[PDB]
Amino acid sequence: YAWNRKRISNCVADYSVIYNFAPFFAFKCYGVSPTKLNDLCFTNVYADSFVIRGNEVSQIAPGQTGNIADYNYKLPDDFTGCVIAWNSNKLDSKPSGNY
Amino acid sequence: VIRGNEVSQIAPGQTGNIADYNYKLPDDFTGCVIAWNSNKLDSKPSGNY
Amino acid sequence: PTYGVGHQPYRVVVLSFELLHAPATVCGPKKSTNLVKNKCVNFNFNGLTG
């Protein structure tokens, strides 16, 4: 409900160093392909960061409704970006409960 | 044996590092790709080098 | 073993099938049937159905 947003601008972007920072599986890119991200140039790139449950990762797609995509974080239907999600059970969970 | 991020590179038409310098598949490829996790046999606590 | 699921090792086996241009040598467990001629019949020649 309070997702951050970082402006990435006035820099050269290497998208092959993304895989060395987080242990995800693959990109989920809409409009583009993740292997052609180094051969083309943008104007502004935004990065939104939040933590959700594994049931609700499918609601981070354009055209989806539900609980996250209704009152928490809604994507436009003309989305031209990539969604990266990975599991984190060793940093976001506690035996007493992370609240 | 590859890493988990690089399983998506074993496909016709993909690029990256494995696809460009280690193992390239043709664009007219026909066949099957079989991948499974091997964390219990191909890993070591000190580093499988 | 302490790395995440994206940095864990994976074993990959790729099978590439060479289609019918040469005489076929890798063929499945289906049995054969005696040949019939001059009769309307469904045939199956090495996977070619007609």
Q: What is the 3-state secondary structure (H, E, C) of chain B?
A: CEECHHHCCCCCCCCCCHHHHCCCCCCCCCEEEEEEECCCCCCCCCCCC
- List residues in chain B touching A: CB distance below 8 A: 4-5, 7-8, 14-17
**CA B11 from centre of chain:** 9
Closest CA to A26 of B26, C45, B11, B28: B11
Q: What residues form DSSP beta bridges with B8? A: none
What residues contact residue A53 under an 8 Å CB cut-off, 6+ apart? none
Cβ–Cβ gap A25/B14 under 8 Å? no
By CB neighbour count within 10 A (0-12 exposed, 13-18 middle, 19+ buried), where does A32 fall?
A: middle
Closest CA to A20 of C4, B36, C11: C4
Beta strands in A1-99 (DSSP E): 4-8, 28-29, 45-49, 82-83
* Chain C contact for B32 (CB, 8 A cutoff): yes
Tokens standing for C11?
């074993």
**CA A41 from centre of chain:** 19
User: Tokens 């494995």 sit at which residue?
Assistant: B18
Task: Give the chain A residue whose CA is nearest to the CA of C4.
Answer: A23
H or E element, residue A68: helix A68-71
User: Tokens 């080098």 sit at which residue?
Assistant: B49
Q: In a 3-state reduction of DSSP, which class is residue A29? A: strand
Q: What residues form DSSP beta bridges with C10? A: B2, B37
What span, in angstroms and rounded, lies between the C-alpha atoms of C43 and B28?
Answer: 29
User: Tokens 């990959």 sit at which residue?
Assistant: C12
Instruction: List CB contacts (< 8 A) between A86 and chain C.
Output: 4-6
What span, in angstroms and rounded, lies between the C-alpha atoms of B14 and B20?
Answer: 9
Task: Give the chain A residue whose CA is nearest to the CA of B13.
Answer: A35
Task: Return the ∠ at Cα B31 (arms to B30 and B34), rounded to 5°.
Answer: 145
Instruction: List CB contacts (< 8 A) between C5 and chain A.
Output: 23, 25, 86-87
Nominal resolution (angstroms):
3.3
What span, in angstroms and rounded, lies between the C-alpha atoms of C4 and A22?
Answer: 8
Distance from CA of A96 to the nearest CA of C (A): 22
